[PDB]
């Protein structure tokens, strides 16, 4: 018995087009259909410079924007050998972590709105509209902040942003507590989530989950502890790791990972060195407006970096960061030219949404939206 | 194993005046009345809402909204036709054609940003050498018809003169970065 | 005495040492079928001998873990059983030996990578206990 | 009649159709009106105390209806057959000899 389970609530899971082969109410197999959001991203990037390539990444995962620009930047610094300053690293993490918070605040309470709890959605989205007052203030666009450029980061924080991020972090433990007091204790929540989509660790490894769905099963594997790719080796934070694997562990993790991300934000705030914002290598970082206008040699680079590009040397690397969805890695083959060459984007949600087939076997049809909830399936990456 | 796991996870809470504590929580909703109480606290608290048309959300001088071609204080469009923004544009929205005007100084005969084919990433504002193209904080230009949304060659992007009073302010405050 | 492996699915095995001895003896016996002058057989022999030795010497699973610093004995059993699968697989489609042409181009690019880039750091040494 | 006929029994029958389609001079005596007994009260004054065994026997008939609807329409969907396929190893010959 085949059922074309589509997007239950649009605007939350946009193009979800499962084709469930059911058995009464018990689902026997879930066959997701991809491509409804397949923009030509892995082709369009081959046609544009390494700078023009960056805006696609904030548009790859639309609920955790800067994590993908941070995964791309670290793939055009893996090749460029472009050492970025300490302040660029600290800002880059303070925003990758603000993005982890922006994602878990959505991927928890959009999940909690698919399950049925209507209010956590709107509380978490007031919180997200506080964090977009930081995105929009530091770069310009509330969602797609093309801000974490290859060398360092686009431009320094405004002169009042750390004070505001602090005044937000002080009041954010309470918001997590409310999102938690409203959902963690509920017997209507546990019942809707405990023993739902349980993934034994061998399955989370096999299906390349590598995210909050690889730390549910108990595999202690965070690419901020495994492969520290910034000040992360300096910052202190504990990676919460589940013990059962059910969608109630992944929720409890995403609601603790939203507190450890608060620890990382507070650290990045309390220790942010007053250094240069971009790599001093002005052939990888366009010089400031003031310098390119006054200096002829800076003007030449501002011209050959906003038209030509880097021309990062010939290589091929797989740089993977811990994006909120999971291990978002961008395999970036680079022909010597200024344009990338098959900038393949390993995006979790392409490996997670595979897991829907075995996660939601023998679960009731109303659980198939809870699974899609805890996978944090955002179809931009799929 | 799940059978033994159940037996043990239920033999953990197996001492009187603990079975009673858990029974009371299930018998009289305790976690759920803590949900209702929080929900009530938020029902009575002030509302984080904004009656939009009259007051609008906070922005920043770096905010990227409607593209505006700036002008030099003494008229003379700031847009010398280098085509750097036409080059840097990721979506290739800007189409620039250049002609030595009769005065002799280069200028763009055609400077058409296609707003629909535009990602509002501010690359044009960065790439332009003289700050000729900047994004005005407008962001309120929803058009009834698509053809209007294609911003014509240097005529509608020349409406930035109205927004110059705010664009000049944002630039005077952002240029420090 | 072990309550549970934190990992889900890897069920705690009470008779860890015994099945480990069984698996490592099976592995030592089954590896004999691959040619001796193959790096795979030297490796299997060496680490299987080391783990079988440390499993015979020590008695508790905790001491097996402590000396043989390779995680948990349940994951060790997973590794040993997967190794037995591989040796019984390698017997088939035997890849041992090198054909005459053997063109293998080792390529080394030594460009240093910037430190602040994902670099898989080694992690704690078996002095974790 | 409303409840236990057109909210239960003809509900059953509707299910069997939808699925499984077939293809002046009175002298009112003002005594006994001083306390008017509603029909429920004057059925309960009898059914539960005086003729109570004809009420415990319909109890057994409702219990037999429960047992019957269970043993009939469990439809092998629970322990009636959801016990197991009941296949054992030591009782098998591993198909070496078909």
């Amino acid at each position: 018995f085949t059922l074309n389970f589509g997007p239950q609530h649009p605007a939350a899971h946009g193009v979800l087009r499962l084709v469930l082969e059911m058995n009464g109410e018990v689902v026997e197999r879930a066959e997701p259909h991809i491509g409804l959001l397949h923009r030509g991203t892995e082709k369009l990037i081959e046609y544009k410079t390494y700078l023009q390539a960056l805006p696609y990444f904030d548009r790859s995962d639309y609920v955790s924007m800067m994590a993908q620009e941070h995964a791309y930047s670290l793939a055009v610094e893996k090749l460029l050998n472009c050492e970025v300053p300490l302040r660029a690293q600290y800002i880059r993490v303070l925003f990758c972590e603000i993005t982890r918070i922006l994602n878990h605040l959505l991927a928890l309470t959009t999940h909690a709105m698919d399950v049925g709890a209507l209010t956590p959605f709107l509380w978490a989205f007031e919180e997200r509209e506080k964090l977009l007052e930081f995105y929009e203030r530091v770069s310009g666009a509330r969602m797609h902040a093309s801000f974490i450029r290859p060398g360092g980061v686009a431009q320094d924080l405004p002169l009042g942003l750390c004070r505001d991020i602090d005044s937000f972090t002080q009041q954010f433990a309470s918001r997590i507590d409310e999102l938690e007091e409203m959902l963690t204790g509920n017997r209507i929540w546990k019942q809707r989530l405990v023993d739902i989509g349980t993934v034994t660790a061998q399955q989370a490894k096999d299906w390349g989950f590598s995210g909050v769905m690889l730390r549910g099963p108990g595999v202690c594997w965070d690419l901020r502890r495994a492969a520290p790719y910034d000040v992360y080796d300096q910052l202190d934070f504990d990676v919460p790791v589940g013990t059962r694997g059910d969608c109630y562990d992944r929720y409890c993790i995403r609601i603790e990972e939203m507190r450890q991300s608060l620890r990382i934000i507070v650290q990045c705030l309390n220790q942010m060195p007053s250094g240069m914002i971009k790599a001093d290598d002005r052939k990888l970082c366009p010089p400031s407006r003031c310098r390119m206008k006054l200096s002829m040699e800076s003007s030449i680079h501002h011209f050959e970096l906003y038209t030509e590009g880097f021309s990062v040397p010939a290589s091929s690397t797989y740089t993977a960061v811990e994006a909120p969805k999971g291990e978002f890695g961008v395999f970036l083959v680079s022909n010597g030219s200024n344009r990338p060459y098959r900038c393949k984007i390993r995006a979790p949600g392409f490996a997670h949404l595979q897991g829907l087939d075995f996660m939601s076997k023998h679960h009731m049809l109303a659980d198939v939206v809870t699974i899609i909830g805890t996978q944090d399936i955002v179809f931009g990456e799929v | 194993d799940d059978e033994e796991a159940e037996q043990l996870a239920k033999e953990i809470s197996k001492d009187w005046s603990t079975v009673f504590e858990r029974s009371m929580n299930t018998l009289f909703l305790t976690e759920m009345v803590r949900g209702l109480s929080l929900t009530l606290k938020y029902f009575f608290d002030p509302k984080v809402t904004i009656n939009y048309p009259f007051e609008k959300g906070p922005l920043s001088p770096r905010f990227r909204g409607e593209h505006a071609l700036r002008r030099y204080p003494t008229g003379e469009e700031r847009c010398i036709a280098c085509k750097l923004c036409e080059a840097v544009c990721p979506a290739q929205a800007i189409t620039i054609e250049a002609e030595e005007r009769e005065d002799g100084s280069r200028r763009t005969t055609r400077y058409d940003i296609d707003m629909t084919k535009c990602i509002y990433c501010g690359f044009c504002q960065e790439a332009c050498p003289v700050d000729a193209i900047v994004e005005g904080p407008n962001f309120e230009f929803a058009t009834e018809t698509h053809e209007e949304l294609l911003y014509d060659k240097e005529k509608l992007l020349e409406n930035g003169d109205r927004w110059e009073t705010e664009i000049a302010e944002n630039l005077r405050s952002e240029s420090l970065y | 005495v072990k309550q549970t492996t934190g990992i889900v699915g890897l069920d705690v095995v009470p008779n860890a040492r015994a099945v480990l001895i069984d698996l490592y003896s099976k592995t030592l016996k089954e590896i004999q079928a691959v040619p001796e002058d193959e790096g795979y057989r030297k490796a299997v022999e060496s680490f299987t001998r080391q783990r079988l030795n440390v499993c015979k010497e020590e008695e508790d699973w905790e001491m097996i873990e402590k000396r043989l610093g390779c995680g948990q004995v349940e994951e060790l059993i997973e590794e040993a059983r997967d190794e037995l699968t591989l040796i019984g697989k390698m017997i088939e489609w035997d890849p041992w030996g090198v054909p005459d042409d053997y063109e293998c181009e080792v390529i080394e690019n030594d460009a240093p990578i910037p430190k602040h880039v994902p670099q898989h750091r080694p992690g704690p040494l078996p002095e974790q206990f | 009649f409303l409840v236990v006929y057109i909210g239960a029994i003809a509900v059953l029958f509707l299910f069997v159709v939808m699925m499984f389609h077939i293809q002046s001079l009175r002298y009112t005596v003002y005594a006994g009106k001083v306390r008017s007994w509603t029909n429920l009260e004057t059925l309960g004054n009898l059914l539960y105390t005086y003729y109570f065994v004809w009420f415990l026997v319909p109890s057994l008939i409702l219990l037999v209806a429960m047992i019957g609807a269970i043993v009939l329409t469990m439809h092998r969907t629970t322990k009636v057959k959801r016990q197991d396929v009941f296949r054992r190893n030591a009782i098998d010959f591993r198909r070496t000899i078909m």
């Binding site: 058995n23 009464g24 018990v26 963690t184 546990k190 019942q191 405990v194 023993d195 739902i196 108990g218 202690c220 965070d222 502890r225 504990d238 990676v239 919460p240 790791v241 589940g242 013990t243 059962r244 059910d246 109630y248 409890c252 603790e256 023998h362 679960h363 009731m364 659980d367 | 799940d2 796991a5 159940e6 996870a9 239920k10 953990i12 | 934190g6 704690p124 974790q128 | 969907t77 959801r82």
Partner: peptide
Amino acid sequence: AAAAAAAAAAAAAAAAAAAAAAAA
């Protein structure tokens, strides 16, 4: 249906961090 029902019993909540709390 013999499908495995979602048993809403489990072990009690105990926040499980990684071993790198104090000294890696």
